[PDB]
Design a protein around this motif. Structure first.
Motif, PDB file in Angstrom:
ATOM      1  N   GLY A 126       0.782  -1.224   0.000  1.00  0.00           N
ATOM      2  CA  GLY A 126       0.000   0.000   0.000  1.00  0.00           C
ATOM      3  C   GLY A 126       0.815   1.276   0.000  1.00  0.00           C
ATOM      4  O   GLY A 126       0.229   2.359  -0.107  1.00  0.00           O
ATOM      5  N   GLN A 127       2.133   1.181   0.121  1.00  0.00           N
ATOM      6  CA  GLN A 127       2.966   2.374   0.118  1.00  0.00           C
ATOM      7  C   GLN A 127       2.900   3.054  -1.248  1.00  0.00           C
ATOM      8  O   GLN A 127       3.055   2.383  -2.277  1.00  0.00           O
ATOM      9  N   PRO A 128       2.672   4.362  -1.302  1.00  0.00           N
ATOM     10  CA  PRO A 128       2.614   5.058  -2.591  1.00  0.00           C
ATOM     11  C   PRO A 128       4.007   5.290  -3.165  1.00  0.00           C
ATOM     12  O   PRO A 128       5.030   5.050  -2.522  1.00  0.00           O
ATOM     13  N   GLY A 129       4.027   5.772  -4.405  1.00  0.00           N
ATOM     14  CA  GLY A 129       5.282   5.984  -5.093  1.00  0.00           C
ATOM     15  C   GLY A 129       6.029   7.206  -4.591  1.00  0.00           C
ATOM     16  O   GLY A 129       5.479   8.088  -3.931  1.00  0.00           O
ATOM     17  N   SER A 130       7.318   7.247  -4.919  1.00  0.00           N
ATOM     18  CA  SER A 130       8.185   8.351  -4.534  1.00  0.00           C
ATOM     19  C   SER A 130       9.341   8.444  -5.519  1.00  0.00           C
ATOM     20  O   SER A 130       9.872   7.420  -5.959  1.00  0.00           O
ATOM     21  N   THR A 131       9.726   9.672  -5.858  1.00  0.00           N
ATOM     22  CA  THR A 131      10.783   9.919  -6.828  1.00  0.00           C
ATOM     23  C   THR A 131      11.698  11.015  -6.302  1.00  0.00           C
ATOM     24  O   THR A 131      11.235  11.958  -5.654  1.00  0.00           O
ATOM     25  N   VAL A 132      12.992  10.888  -6.580  1.00  0.00           N
ATOM     26  CA  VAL A 132      13.991  11.830  -6.081  1.00  0.00           C
ATOM     27  C   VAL A 132      14.897  12.274  -7.227  1.00  0.00           C
ATOM     28  O   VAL A 132      15.262  11.454  -8.082  1.00  0.00           O
ATOM     29  N   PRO A 133      15.266  13.558  -7.300  1.00  0.00           N
ATOM     30  CA  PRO A 133      16.181  14.006  -8.360  1.00  0.00           C
ATOM     31  C   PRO A 133      17.621  13.568  -8.133  1.00  0.00           C
ATOM     32  O   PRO A 133      17.909  12.804  -7.209  1.00  0.00           O
ATOM     33  N   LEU A 134      18.532  14.056  -8.978  1.00  0.00           N
ATOM     34  CA  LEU A 134      19.912  13.581  -8.970  1.00  0.00           C
ATOM     35  C   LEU A 134      20.756  14.290  -7.913  1.00  0.00           C
ATOM     36  O   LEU A 134      21.483  13.640  -7.150  1.00  0.00           O
ATOM     37  N   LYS A 135      20.682  15.622  -7.866  1.00  0.00           N
ATOM     38  CA  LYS A 135      21.550  16.386  -6.974  1.00  0.00           C
ATOM     39  C   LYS A 135      21.298  16.032  -5.515  1.00  0.00           C
ATOM     40  O   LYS A 135      22.241  15.937  -4.717  1.00  0.00           O
ATOM     41  N   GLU A 136      20.030  15.844  -5.146  1.00  0.00           N
ATOM     42  CA  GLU A 136      19.710  15.463  -3.776  1.00  0.00           C
ATOM     43  C   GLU A 136      20.340  14.123  -3.421  1.00  0.00           C
ATOM     44  O   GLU A 136      20.887  13.959  -2.325  1.00  0.00           O
ATOM     45  N   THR A 137      20.277  13.155  -4.338  1.00  0.00           N
ATOM     46  CA  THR A 137      20.905  11.861  -4.090  1.00  0.00           C
ATOM     47  C   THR A 137      22.415  11.997  -3.952  1.00  0.00           C
ATOM     48  O   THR A 137      23.025  11.347  -3.093  1.00  0.00           O
ATOM     49  N   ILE A 138      23.037  12.828  -4.791  1.00  0.00           N
ATOM     50  CA  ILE A 138      24.485  13.013  -4.710  1.00  0.00           C
ATOM     51  C   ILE A 138      24.874  13.588  -3.353  1.00  0.00           C
ATOM     52  O   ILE A 138      25.799  13.100  -2.690  1.00  0.00           O
ATOM     53  N   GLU A 139      24.160  14.629  -2.916  1.00  0.00           N
ATOM     54  CA  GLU A 139      24.466  15.239  -1.625  1.00  0.00           C
ATOM     55  C   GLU A 139      24.212  14.269  -0.478  1.00  0.00           C
ATOM     56  O   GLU A 139      24.995  14.210   0.478  1.00  0.00           O
ATOM     57  N   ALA A 140      23.121  13.503  -0.551  1.00  0.00           N
ATOM     58  CA  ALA A 140      22.822  12.542   0.503  1.00  0.00           C
ATOM     59  C   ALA A 140      23.897  11.468   0.594  1.00  0.00           C
ATOM     60  O   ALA A 140      24.310  11.084   1.694  1.00  0.00           O
ATOM     61  N   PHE A 141      24.362  10.968  -0.553  1.00  0.00           N
ATOM     62  CA  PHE A 141      25.407   9.952  -0.532  1.00  0.00           C
ATOM     63  C   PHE A 141      26.719  10.522  -0.015  1.00  0.00           C
ATOM     64  O   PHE A 141      27.459   9.836   0.699  1.00  0.00           O
ATOM     65  N   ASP A 142      27.029  11.775  -0.362  1.00  0.00           N
ATOM     66  CA  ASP A 142      28.220  12.405   0.198  1.00  0.00           C
ATOM     67  C   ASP A 142      28.116  12.521   1.714  1.00  0.00           C
ATOM     68  O   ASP A 142      29.082  12.243   2.436  1.00  0.00           O
ATOM     69  N   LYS A 143      26.946  12.922   2.214  1.00  0.00           N
ATOM     70  CA  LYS A 143      26.750  13.014   3.657  1.00  0.00           C
ATOM     71  C   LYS A 143      26.911  11.654   4.324  1.00  0.00           C
ATOM     72  O   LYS A 143      27.564  11.538   5.368  1.00  0.00           O
ATOM     73  N   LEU A 144      26.319  10.613   3.735  1.00  0.00           N
ATOM     74  CA  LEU A 144      26.403   9.281   4.326  1.00  0.00           C
ATOM     75  C   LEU A 144      27.833   8.755   4.326  1.00  0.00           C
ATOM     76  O   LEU A 144      28.286   8.179   5.322  1.00  0.00           O
ATOM     77  N   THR A 145      28.563   8.939   3.223  1.00  0.00           N
ATOM     78  CA  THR A 145      29.940   8.462   3.178  1.00  0.00           C
ATOM     79  C   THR A 145      30.866   9.302   4.045  1.00  0.00           C
ATOM     80  O   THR A 145      31.939   8.823   4.424  1.00  0.00           O
ATOM     81  N   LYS A 146      30.482  10.541   4.369  1.00  0.00           N
ATOM     82  CA  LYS A 146      31.271  11.316   5.320  1.00  0.00           C
ATOM     83  C   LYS A 146      31.133  10.770   6.735  1.00  0.00           C
ATOM     84  O   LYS A 146      32.094  10.814   7.510  1.00  0.00           O
ATOM     85  N   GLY A 147      29.958  10.256   7.087  1.00  0.00           N
ATOM     86  CA  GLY A 147      29.758   9.644   8.385  1.00  0.00           C
ATOM     87  C   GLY A 147      29.166  10.574   9.423  1.00  0.00           C
ATOM     88  O   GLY A 147      29.672  10.656  10.547  1.00  0.00           O
TER      89      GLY A 147
END
Ligand SMILES: Nc1ncnc2c1ncn2[C@@H]1O[C@H](COP(=O)(O)OP(=O)(O)OP(=O)(O)O)[C@@H](O)[C@H]1O
Ligand SMILES: Nc1ncnc2c1ncn2[C@@H]1O[C@H](COP(=O)(O)OP(=O)(O)OP(=O)(O)O)[C@@H](O)[C@H]1O
Ligand SMILES: [Mg+2]
Ligand SMILES: [Mg+2]
Lengths: 47, 464, 516
Positions: B417-438
């Motif tokens: 029942g969970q609805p759909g969700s979409t994310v752009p590119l720059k947000e993903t890049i920044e989020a991955f940088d934040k996660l890999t920074k720790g």
């Protein structure tokens, strides 16, 4: 002093597992290749 | 003039002709079958010459109920299918007869199914950064416009769902014509796809052609050629961008193996027919974009029992440029997209044409996952308490990252029942940088599962 | 209408020169066809591997003889073949037209210009099948054939006339190394006399056309297009072209080699050729063997890869070097073709995928790679500078396996571990960036003497690069000396030490500290 011997015996026991698994793998490979060649020759000669 | 039938067995039928009447290779032949209840018209295509005015061929219809001595007539022409603008919004079988309306589409021009690949002098590489809304494909292996895109994996991993989601996301934002071809799949999937397309207005913009598996092997080997003929006709004269989707490729190779077993050729390794690579290369050369025309194709390839040592996947890999494969271990773990980043690769991912931050982030995450895969067995046996501080930190970061790559899609609405969700590119890049920074390590385990956006992550964090 | 005048003159000259003769020959008939082969009967006497001729214009060759039948293989178009055609025995064993106008073009494996460029000229025809040079016409190998890669020439040297093998797993970077080597010789070509000039050739088998176009674009942008040629057999061709292209490439290279010019043959893939030969043999109904392979397959490779060898001064002292490429699956080496090709050549360069996954970009394994020639194909200066770092790296990895969880160690052990880590981090290198000999020697000398042992391992490479750049800007004597004498002098070493000290005094990356 009690700790050291446990690691020694652990390594000594770990080697034989490698040996036995190597033997089993070689046997399986030989069986597979001989089965494949037997099947292909039997299929080819039938015609 | 006409010939006769002397032998019949399986699908293959051989016929005899008088002197000076043998037809060339790949010529259609018609045969008459009569009965109280089983009346049809057998269509056959010439396969090979046996000499002595004997020609051996195969059939596109079941051979049940045929009797020797029945005359066989020749048309002196190859298989053909009508083409044109009117083909849009209709369903066709292999022979070209319209399934929706029995009499529709019997007046347009006709083209031979057999063609020639384009000459080498008119080839040009295509480089473009085509972006979707999914994190894994956006970051790891970006897709290429006007190039080859394909999937991999065993049975029941979720390739068809991914194809449906991809076409649903793209066809809404396309000005060109798309053509769908179904080589092998259950009839329920085709019926549901037709109904779903009818639920929107996109059906009038696309044309569908497909055959099922219950049909004799003759039909399964010819649908792809007809689809390619239609796509080539649309591309060549209209000068318009085209989209092409193929459900499977393994099916027609299987059909070729089946027919070559009976045709009289010797077998090869792993019981495959000889000269499969030649046929695969001849067919795969058709899908190509010239300098002025662009066509984007997405294919799905099945593998038997999750074995990449099989010669067929190894042969078909060399024809690809951008590839993404699926694994069963990650599916058994729970992650829904089930994409393995370690083995997948792209062909446009280099800092020459892409910002260096993308390259650095990709390299860092790949190294972290590789190290975790290495430390797997020691963690499992001796436990986390034996490692040092660095190993523990990398293990935690690997767990966080591995959980974060999951994402819910709209096509999952029927199942969850969970609805759909979409994310752009720059947000993903920044989020991955934040996660890999720790700097997100304080969050619990469940906060990083099935997360679409960073704000959704924060909201879930406040919910526990 | 000057061009029109030339066209009219050419047409008139050709048309007024028409002539033909009435001569007898033997003609046979086709009895059956299909699946890429056809059977022809009626020819009394035809040599094996004869180039037949068919009425539609398609060609073929004869492989299998019989008491009343002749096998055949259709090379080009196949659908025009039907019962009732008449064959015509023509000429003799097929050959290739070789010359010197082939440079900078792409040709059909049979010798036709598939490129959009106009037709090419011809110099002389050479038959594919000829005996290799004897055992009494060869010298020893001694020459520094550069490759542009630090790891390759530091670990496994390559000389003229030496066959070197590259075996790799899927998606590793073999073609990148091949392209870097193939374009490294621009400066060598720029020199006047042909003593440094090398004429290189490329062969592509069973590859997509777009990939070939991309490779051609890369070479053209590199500027090395002037002294190279390409032979291409894409997947759309029949089995004959895929089977026959390498012989054509080898013959074209051998003609240049035989007259005193150094060349460099490169085979893109050999598995595809073996598969094509297997398909042809199975279709011609010959007895099969292990892995559905004919017995003679090994012999095949021995006939092809053995052509290249160093020549003696009596015949002009030519040379030829081969770089075959092999693809293996699932990190398996016990397969048939890999074992055969390994046992037939010397020197190997294993390309693991785990190393390529993280860290090293060249991703060349060190503990398995070997070169038979070794020091006989090295430069004296870099041989002196090498300092036998192989053992250092070996004990470094052996110890660092232990010292991952160990904090208390012997001081010398820690120093050795740090030296090994620094060398490993130094040995990396990006793509599309060849290096000349002098900077490689300078970098290796910097690495070996321990000058950079004070540099933190995280930012060494950049620092090194900067040093090189600075050394190229404000200094030029050391390069001249190493180029002229091929030896490193003590005074040059002292000057380089002073330069290194003064440069390292003023470099910082992150909380750095210049030290003695
Ligand atoms: N992203 C997803 N969202 C919801 N369900 C999913 C997702 N991925 C996989 N599944 C589930 O996994 C199964 C995959 O179904 P499906 O038949 O499409 O598999 P497939 O491996 O693509 O094979 P096929 O080609 O036979 O369709 C279904 O039960 C589906 O509900
Ligand atoms: N030194 C390097 N630094 C960075 N990237 C590199 C380097 N060497 C190779 N690569 C990258 O690795 C990939 C190797 O591609 P390449 O064309 O060499 O194929 P390959 O691994 O030899 O395989 P195949 O011939 O089977 O396609 C490319 O994406 C290339 O950009
Ligand atoms: Mg599916
Ligand atoms: Mg490559």
């Amino acid at each position: 002093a009690s700790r050291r011997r446990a690691m020694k015996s652990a390594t000594d026991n770990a080697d034989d597992l490698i040996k036995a698994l190597t033997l089993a793998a070689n046997r399986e490979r030989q069986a597979q290749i001989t089965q494949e060649i037997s099947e292909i020759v039997g299929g080819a000669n039938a015609l | 003039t006409a010939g006769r039938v002397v032998r019949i067995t399986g699908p293959v039928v051989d016929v005899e002709f008088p002197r000076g009447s043998v037809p060339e290779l790949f010529n259609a032949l018609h045969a008459e079958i009569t009965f109280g209840a089983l009346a049809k018209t057998l269509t056959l295509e010439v396969a090979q010459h046996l000499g002595d005015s004997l020609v051996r061929c195969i059939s596109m219809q079941p051979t049940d109920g045929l009797v020797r001595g029945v005359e066989v007539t020749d048309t002196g022409a190859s298989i053909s299918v009508p083409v044109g603008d009117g083909v849009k919004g209709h369903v066709f079988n292999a022979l070209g007869d319209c399934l929706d309306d029995p009499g529709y589409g019997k007046d347009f021009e006709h083209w031979s199914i057999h063609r020639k690949p384009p000459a080498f002098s008119d080839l040009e590489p295509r480089t473009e950064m085509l972006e979707t809304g999914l994190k894994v494909v956006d970051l790891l292996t970006p897709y290429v416009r006007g190039g080859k895109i394909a999937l991999f994996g065993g049975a029941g991993v979720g390739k068809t769902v991914l194809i449906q989601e991809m076409i649903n996301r793209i066809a809404r934002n396309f000005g060109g014509t798309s053509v769908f071809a179904g080589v092998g799949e259950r009839t329920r999937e085709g019926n549901d796809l037709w109904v779903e397309l009818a639920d929107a207005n996109v059906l009038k913009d696309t044309a569908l052609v497909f055959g099922q598996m219950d049909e004799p092997p003759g039909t399964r080997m010819r649908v792809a050629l007809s689809a390619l003929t239609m796509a080539e006709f649309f591309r060549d004269e209209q000068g318009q961008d085209v989209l092409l989707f193929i459900d499977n490729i393994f099916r027609f190779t299987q059909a070729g193996s089946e027919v070559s077993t009976l045709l009289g050729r010797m077998p090869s390794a792993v019981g495959y027919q000889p000269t499969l690579a030649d046929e695969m290369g001849e067919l795969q050369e058709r899908i190509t974009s010239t300098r002025g025309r662009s066509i984007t194709s997405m294919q799905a390839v099945y593998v038997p029992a999750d074995d990449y040592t099989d010669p067929a996947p190894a042969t078909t890999f060399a024809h690809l440029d951008a590839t993404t494969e699926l694994s069963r271990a990650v599916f058994s773990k729970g992650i829904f997209p089930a994409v393995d980043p370690l083995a997948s690769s792209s062909t446009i991912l280099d800092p020459a044409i892409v910002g260096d931050e993308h390259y650095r982030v990709a390299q860092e995450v790949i190294r972290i996952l590789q190290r975790y895969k290495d430390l797997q067995d020691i963690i499992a046996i001796l436990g986390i308490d034996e490692l040092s501080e660095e190993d523990k930190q990398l293990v935690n970061r690997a767990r966080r990252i591995e959980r974060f790559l999951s994402q819910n899609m709209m096509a999952a609405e029927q199942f969850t029942g969970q609805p759909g969700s979409t994310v752009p590119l720059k947000e993903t890049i920044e989020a991955f940088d934040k996660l890999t920074k720790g700097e997100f390590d304080h969050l619990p385990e469940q906060a990083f599962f099935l997360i679409g956006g960073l704000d959704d992550l924060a909201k879930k964090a406040e919910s526990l | 209408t000057i061009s029109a005048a030339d066209i009219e003159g050419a047409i008139e000259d050709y048309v007024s020169s028409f002539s033909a003769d009435t001569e007898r020959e033997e003609i046979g008939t086709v009895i059956d066809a299909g699946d890429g082969i056809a059977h022809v009967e009626g020819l009394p006497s035809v040599m094996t591997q004869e180039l037949l001729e068919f009425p539609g214009g398609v060609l073929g060759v004869a492989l299998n003889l019989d008491e009343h039948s002749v096998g055949a293989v259709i090379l080009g178009e196949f659908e025009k073949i039907e019962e009732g055609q008449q064959v015509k025995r023509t000429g003799e064993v097929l050959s290739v037209p070789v010359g010197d106008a082939f440079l900078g073009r792409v040709v059909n494996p049979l010798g036709q210009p598939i490129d959009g460029q106009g037709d090419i000229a011809a110099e002389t025809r050479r038959a594919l099948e000829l005996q290799a040079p004897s055992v009494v016409q060869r010298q020893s190998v001694s020459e520094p054939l550069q490759t542009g890669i630090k790891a390759i020439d530091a670990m496994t040297p390559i000389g003229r006339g030496q066959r070197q093998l590259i075996i790799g797993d899927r998606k590793t970077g073999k073609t990148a190394v091949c392209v870097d080597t193939i374009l490294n010789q621009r400066e060598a070509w720029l020199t006047g006399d042909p003593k440094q000039q090398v004429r290189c050739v490329y062969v592509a088998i069973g590859q997509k056309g777009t990939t070939i176009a991309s490779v051609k674009r890369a070479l053209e942008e590199g500027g090395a297009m002037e002294y190279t040629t390409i032979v291409a057999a894409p997947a759309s061709d029949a089995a004959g072209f895929k089977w026959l292209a390498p012989y054509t490439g080898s013959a074209i290279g051998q003609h240049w080699m035989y007259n005193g010019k150094h060349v460099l043959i490169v085979f893109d893939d050999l598995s595809k050729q073996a598969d094509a030969y297997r398909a042809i043999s199975l279709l011609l109904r010959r007895p099969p063997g292990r892995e559905a392979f004919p017995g003679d397959v090994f012999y095949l490779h021995s006939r092809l890869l053995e052509r290249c060898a160093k020549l003696s001064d009596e015949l002009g002292g030519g040379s030829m070097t081969g770089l075959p490429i092999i693809e293996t699956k699932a990190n398996d080496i016990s397969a048939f073709i890999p074992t055969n090709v390994i046992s037939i050549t010397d020197g190997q360069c294993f390309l693991e995928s785990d190393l390529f996954n993280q860290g090293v970009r060249p991703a060349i394994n060190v503990g398995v790679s070997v070169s038979r020639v070794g020091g006989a194909a090295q430069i004296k200066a870099m041989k002196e500078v090498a300092g036998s770092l192989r053992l250092d790296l070996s004990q470094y990895r052996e110890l660092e396996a232990f010292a991952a969880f160990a904090s208390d160690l012997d001081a010398a052990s820690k120093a050795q571990l740090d030296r090994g880590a620094r060398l490993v981090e130094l040995l990396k290198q990006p793509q599309y960036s060849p290096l000349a000999v002098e900077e490689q020697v300078v970098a290796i000398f910097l690495g070996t003497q321990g000058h950079l042992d004070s540099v933190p391992v995280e930012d060494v490479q950049r620092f090194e690069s900067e040093l090189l750049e600075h050394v190229k800007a404000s200094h030029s004597d050391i390069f001249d000396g190493i180029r002229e004498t091929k030896k490193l002098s003590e005074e040059a070493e002292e000057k380089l030490v002073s330069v290194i000290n003064e440069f390292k005094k003023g470099f910082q990356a992150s909380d750095g500290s210049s030290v003695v």
